[PDB]
Amino acid sequence: MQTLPKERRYETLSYLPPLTDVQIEKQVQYILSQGYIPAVEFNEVSEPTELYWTLWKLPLFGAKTSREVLAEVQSCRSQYPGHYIRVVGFDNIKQCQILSFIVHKP
Amino acid sequence: MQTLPKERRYETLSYLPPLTDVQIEKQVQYILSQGYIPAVEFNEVSEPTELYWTLWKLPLFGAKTSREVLAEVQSCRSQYPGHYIRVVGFDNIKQCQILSFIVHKP
Amino acid sequence: RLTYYTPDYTPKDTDILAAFRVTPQPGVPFEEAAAAVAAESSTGDLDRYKGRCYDIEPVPGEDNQFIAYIAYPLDLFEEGSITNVLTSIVGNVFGFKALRALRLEDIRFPVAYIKTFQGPPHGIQVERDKLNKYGRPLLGCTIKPKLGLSAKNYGRAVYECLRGGLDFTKDDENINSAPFQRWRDRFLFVADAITKAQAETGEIKGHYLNVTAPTCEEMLKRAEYAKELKQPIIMHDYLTAGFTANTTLARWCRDNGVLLHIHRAMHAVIDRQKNHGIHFRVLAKALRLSGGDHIHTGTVVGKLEGERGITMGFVDLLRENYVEQDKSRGIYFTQDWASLPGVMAVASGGIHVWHMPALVEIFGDDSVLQFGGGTLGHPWGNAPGATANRVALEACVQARNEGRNLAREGNDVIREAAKWSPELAVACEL
Amino acid sequence: RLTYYTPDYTPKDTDILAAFRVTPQPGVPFEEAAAAVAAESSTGTLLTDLDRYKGRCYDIEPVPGEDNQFIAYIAYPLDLFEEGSITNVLTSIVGNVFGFKALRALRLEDIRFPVAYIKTFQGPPHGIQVERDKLNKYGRPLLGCTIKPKLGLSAKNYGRAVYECLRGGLDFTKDDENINSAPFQRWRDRFLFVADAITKAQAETGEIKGHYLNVTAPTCEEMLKRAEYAKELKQPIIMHDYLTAGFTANTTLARWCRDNGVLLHIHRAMHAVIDRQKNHGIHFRVLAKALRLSGGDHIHTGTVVGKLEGERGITMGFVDLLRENYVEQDKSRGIYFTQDWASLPGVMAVASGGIHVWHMPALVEIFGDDSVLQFGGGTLGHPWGNAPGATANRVALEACVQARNEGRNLAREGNDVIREAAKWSPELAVACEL
Amino acid sequence: RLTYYTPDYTPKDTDILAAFRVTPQPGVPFEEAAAAVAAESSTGDLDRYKGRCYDIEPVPGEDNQFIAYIAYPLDLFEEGSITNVLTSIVGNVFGFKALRALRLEDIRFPVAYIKTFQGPPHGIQVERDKLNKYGRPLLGCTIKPKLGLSAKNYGRAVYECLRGGLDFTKDDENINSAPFQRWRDRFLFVADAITKAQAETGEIKGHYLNVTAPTCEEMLKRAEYAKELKQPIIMHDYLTAGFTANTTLARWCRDNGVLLHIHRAMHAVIDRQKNHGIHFRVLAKALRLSGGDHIHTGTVVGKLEGERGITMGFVDLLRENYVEQDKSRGIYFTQDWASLPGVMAVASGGIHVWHMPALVEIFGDDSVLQFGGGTLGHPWGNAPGATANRVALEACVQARNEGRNLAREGNDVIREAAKWSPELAVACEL
Amino acid sequence: RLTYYTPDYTPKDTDILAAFRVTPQPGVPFEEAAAAVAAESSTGTLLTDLDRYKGRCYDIEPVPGEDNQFIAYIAYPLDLFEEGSITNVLTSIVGNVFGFKALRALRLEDIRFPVAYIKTFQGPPHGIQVE
């Protein structure tokens, strides 16, 4: 018998325990093997009232393996230690966004 | 293949590498030899939403050499180490302002 | 008569088709009642403006009942008025005496007549962009107890649900304003419970502030006040307040950026009988053409394969752009919505923690999941009861974003999330 | 449950009673379904006081002659509902409770708005009395054509059929259900060419003729700019389809017509979705009481002539609910609760069946003075046009008004006064055969 | 007739001169058609109110074509109405049958009639004071793709361009509101992308929010909403929406502090042909007298010496106070603008990184440079593609503020800025 | 280009057709200019779906008796344009496309507003009949 403490618990996939390197790439493999476009985004602060996250280098239109989508975030580990890095997944056609998960936190 | 990091990059002449002492005086020599009035301005913070920069001693109406416009900023180096010093260039007649470049930064 | 039954009339792409479910009186033949359900819904200058029947299609598995497809012309009806579709079509036709029970099953608003309407204020895509809530079905408490809670103690129960990761929190049907709780003070102490629950957990929290009012002047001054509390969403009981007040508020919510949660209050007077009334897939089309960014579509969990085929039938009608004519799923006409915005499908029955694997598979991303409907609360309160319904949500979205078949590996992903969540593990059984 | 079934609870004079007609699923006992229809219309299945805001079933009374059906009298308190909101009565009472799954059918038969709760409403804009005082038409049931054909007529040809009916003694003339505005006939032009045809027929024959201009509209802004235009044509009366357009748009136009002196003709379009089945829905005496509390000076109560004794006692039940101040509890006549209207103004009861000349003995005897008699709905007009067709429908009125005012029992001596008025009227004699 | 050709009429300083380019039918003499292009643009008194021709001046290098200078009086025309200049002058004169092609080349609004108008809401000087952007020509993306982008994904492409040092970002022509992207939600998610791109880089970022609408009520409620997002600038397609809607919006943008980006949509129906139509230097004068703080003047880079003499001809007409009569540059009348505010000249063709040395020399400080017009984007995206177009801007303004001749030392200052900029060095070739 | 010239495309009953009279500059073939007048009046030269919002030329039909001229029938979709805005038809269709430089002259001959798009407008205030 207990309450919930006061954390930020950022957007989505954030009340579950923080997703490890297997669960990062399995969701990245869900992006490409379902035909979505794995884009990487970063931002200074991760509240969901700052509405735009700044897009890392490209949204990776021709990304086919998780070993290179994560390897673009490997180029984004050392670049931004203090930014909430995030791999989003855009729909290829129908104008929507699906996956959203922070891969790196300050 | 790389993105642009998040800096302030203040107003104008600010995405190029910061202008050195030769490029300060060559732009100051562009102010007087084109008949503009070299005024010196300073401010605490250099965002371009604080609209007025505080004018240093005079706008130097009869300034004829770059060795003395810079020598008024030499009197403004030690005065204000923490203010964004700036030599602006006002039009002599037609009510406009042209040159704008930070010569000293905190 | 019998000039209103034209069975060779291949209906035009600009007609407004209507598929009744006629149960005629004994002795009434099927051609004569189908010409009569097309009769008194028109012209009780007649060859161009006539509601005419063009197909019979008797109900399989049952005698003395058929599905009379009526083909109303376009220029009979008002541009932009869904209270003129229901005045014209179902106005004086259900009371016709040679019909034991007449039920409007489905209706086809064409591309020509959908463009006169507004659609929802904000679709699925525009709503989720405003809320910044992507890739998961949203959430909701309904504040129990309904009545009695003073405007702050109501707001304290809103703050307590919205702390625990709950996206939205519904205001009740019968809470508009009442001498224990006025709307001006309910809306104040709720918008003061949202700006604390949105500052605590940074997500855009909202509350479906009930703006259903006696007059349309008291409804817009009840919505112009939820606008000036900077509230993301309001709600409106669209069948007690009607399609003139809803379309008034539709046009307002588009023109003031407020999302609209259409509640289907009093929907079951007019559809819950399977032989007489207006089936909800007509009323779901009717409020997609008036406004609503949400609509209650009830629940799927307490329903059989046919009763959730029909329930998923109108969920696609109010959410997908093009829906093919699939009569076993209930949709009687191929409906092209002509890029009209979608409406959410809000699941609100007796659903609880363990129905999250089903209702992320059945209802997709584009859904809202209400709670507290029939279930006996949560033994630790609201803020654990909402964190249970949010961890069990996102445990099912995590497994769905990893390919795990949530029909069979769904009860596993609740039980392996009860380990890494203590508020979930006590709602894991009751 | 069974905390919501208090069978000893004498209901207060300020409760809002409701008499459902519950048809429960089998195995559900009668008290536990009647406590359930008192449950999910309140205080659903401690943070508050339950015993102050709960709906309480207080009597069962099984329907005679039919098992698996009873009349759950529910007693909702006063301070549960909104002052002045008849769309919060229905959101509370018939909101979340008919789709309840332990019930095969549920029918809100009757509802007792107390004197405490009637006074928050407005009533009609104008009663029986103030409607007759505005129109200067005393001691007769008023009249109306219905402009056939409905669809296709341009706005001037529509107003010529209005002017033709309004010459020959007709009082009102109804605009149709499915006519609000449509690409052949816009409302701004339909209202214009009807105001030019009332003030021609009102100036010709010196009675205050009117026309039920249809202000039913997509939005409440478009409704009030459609009614404020019929105000500025100095029209006496508008009309409104109150169940398609709802009770928020009706109560908006209620408050408008009282504040602008326009009579409001409430039309019961889409009523038969919910009052026509005998087991499920909302009986029209709820929806009759619901618009006497919101606006309307007239409401269609259908007809009597095609119905049995039991089906017209129920129809003369809700004619009295919307027209009389105090109506006693009589369940054979359909009324379940005694209803004090607290001097709320009456509503006319409009007769609009498939009726013609030979029904003027019947509908002046059944529906009294305080009524309106529509025509042209089912019957096939008149061979000489509309103005001899309306004089046939007006000489047959005042023959049956004169006969009723001389002791002549129109139930038995009614067909004599049609035949002895067809002599002195050539327009009625050709209408005397069909 | 031939009382409308008065060749000794030295025109008054209060007349409104118009220089047509008549191409008469074969057999029509030049005095008779010039009295006829002055005929049906008036009086189809006479000595006080006739449009009269006062000079012929045949086109050098071409027969059967001349430049009929018509001299309309002042008191024929409405004070403050440029839809009455085009109703009076070019109303019923181009359809006259003795003329094979009639083209209005230039027009002289006098000092007497310019003072009745408003001018731009904000000039060059007042606009740059509001934006605090001095001594360099401003910038712009045009968000490609045009269509399809939802209101937030459109805003995300606005945020991405405006991060990279881009001053403004244009909304398209055909983006007003459409079922994939409504204006209420386009304007919201763009003003939420400006307050992030202005907070990131402190410069005053703006977006030319398209307020072109079906009605003038739907245009001002589309501009009163961009006012209440605290937006610096809007835009308006000024020839599809007309000169009654611009002058409505000019008078609004001056009276609400919003800058106005006049877009020359549908301009090339009426000036692409070199013998018939209304040349853009009339239409550039026509919107300097209605409002606009910007106007597209196309581009200079894909044009010869005469076609950019004409292009720099009306760029001086819409930006400089006094412009001398210089017919080789295209300006047919000496135009005194009477201290009316200037209009920006927005270069928007297929210009890219390497045209920065030319377009800082050709178009001066008082200019805006759009991008994405014909070029195949930037290989690294938008925020590198805007930093390329901003470093290459300010490398050319740095060299211009040091006396370097940007006609010859211009390609050097791009290549010596590709060293100290990596986003520029990849746009340095493609 | 030639992704905007779909010659087999039977246009839908809800497209907004447009029949230009293209007079292309010489050396520009007829399909590539007709794909271009379908280009810069939409979707100009994977961030969205191209094939849903693009203007498609669907027939050429050379003008009889005069070479270097044809009638490019362009098929714009419905949901590209604004409900009720005839100044967004012209901003879309004749906006950015006549000043196109591969064309010596371009004339919008006719345009088919569908029944789906006429109903968003008002029409005249009063017709022939009501006038």
Swiss-Prot record, chains A, B:
A cellular component term, taken from the record's GO annotations: carboxysome
Subcellular location: Carboxysome
Keywords: Bacterial microcompartment, Calvin cycle, Carbon dioxide fixation, Carboxysome, Photorespiration, Photosynthesis
Pfam families: RuBisCO_small
One example of a Gene Ontology biological process annotation: reductive pentose-phosphate cycle
Induction: Part of the rbcL-rbcS operon, transcribed in light and constitutively during growth on fructose.
InterPro entries: RuBisCO_ssu, RuBisCO_ssu_dom, RuBisCO_ssu_sf
Molecular functions per Gene Ontology: ribulose-bisphosphate carboxylase activity
Predominant subcellular localization, coarse grouping: other
Extra information: RuBisCO folding and assembly commences when the nascent large subunit folds with the help of chaperonin GroEL-GroES. Both RbcX and Raf1 help folded RbcL release from the chaperonin and dimerize; dimeric Raf1 binds to RbcL(2) leading to an RbcL8-Raf1(8) complex. RbcS displaces Raf1, resulting in holoenzyme formation.
Chain's role: RuBisCO catalyzes two reactions: the carboxylation of D-ribulose 1,5-bisphosphate, the primary event in carbon dioxide fixation, as well as the oxidative fragmentation of the pentose substrate in the photorespiration process. Both reactions occur simultaneously and in competition at the same active site. Although the small subunit is not catalytic it is essential for maximal activity.
Description of how the protein assembles with itself and partners: Heterohexadecamer of 8 large and 8 small subunits. Forms complexes of many stoichiometries with Raf1 and RbcL.
Family, per entry: Belongs to the RuBisCO small chain family.
PANTHER family (UniProt xref): RIBULOSE BISPHOSPHATE CARBOXYLASE SMALL CHAIN 1, CHLOROPLASTIC
Protein name per the record: Ribulose bisphosphate carboxylase small subunit
Species annotation: Nostoc sp. (strain PCC 7120 / SAG 25.82 / UTEX 2576)
Curated annotation (Swiss-Prot), chain F:
Origin: domain of life: Bacteria
Chain residues that bind substrate: 96
Induction of synthesis: Part of the rbcL-rbcS operon, transcribed in light and constitutively during growth on fructose.
Subcellular compartments: Carboxysome
PTM note: The disulfide bond which can form in the large chain dimeric partners within the hexadecamer appears to be associated with oxidative stress and protein turnover.
Transmembrane segments: none
Note: RuBisCO folding and assembly commences when the nascent large subunit folds with the help of chaperonin GroEL-GroES. Both RbcX and Raf1 help folded RbcL release from the chaperonin and dimerize; dimeric Raf1 binds to RbcL(2) leading to an RbcL8-Raf1(8) complex. RbcS displaces Raf1, resulting in holoenzyme formation. The basic functional RuBisCO is composed of a large chain homodimer in a 'head-to-tail' conformation. In form I RuBisCO this homodimer is arranged in a barrel-like tetramer with the small subunits forming a tetrameric 'cap' on each end of the 'barrel'.
Subunit structure: Heterohexadecamer of 8 large chains and 8 small chains; disulfide-linked. The disulfide link is formed within the large subunit homodimers. Forms complexes of many stoichiometries with Raf1 with and without RbcS. RuBisCO interacts with the C-terminus of CcmM.
Role description: RuBisCO catalyzes two reactions: the carboxylation of D-ribulose 1,5-bisphosphate, the primary event in carbon dioxide fixation, as well as the oxidative fragmentation of the pentose substrate in the photorespiration process. Both reactions occur simultaneously and in competition at the same active site.
The family this protein is said to belong to: Belongs to the RuBisCO large chain family. Type I subfamily.
Protein name as it appears in the record: Ribulose bisphosphate carboxylase large chain
Gene name for this UniProt entry: cbbL
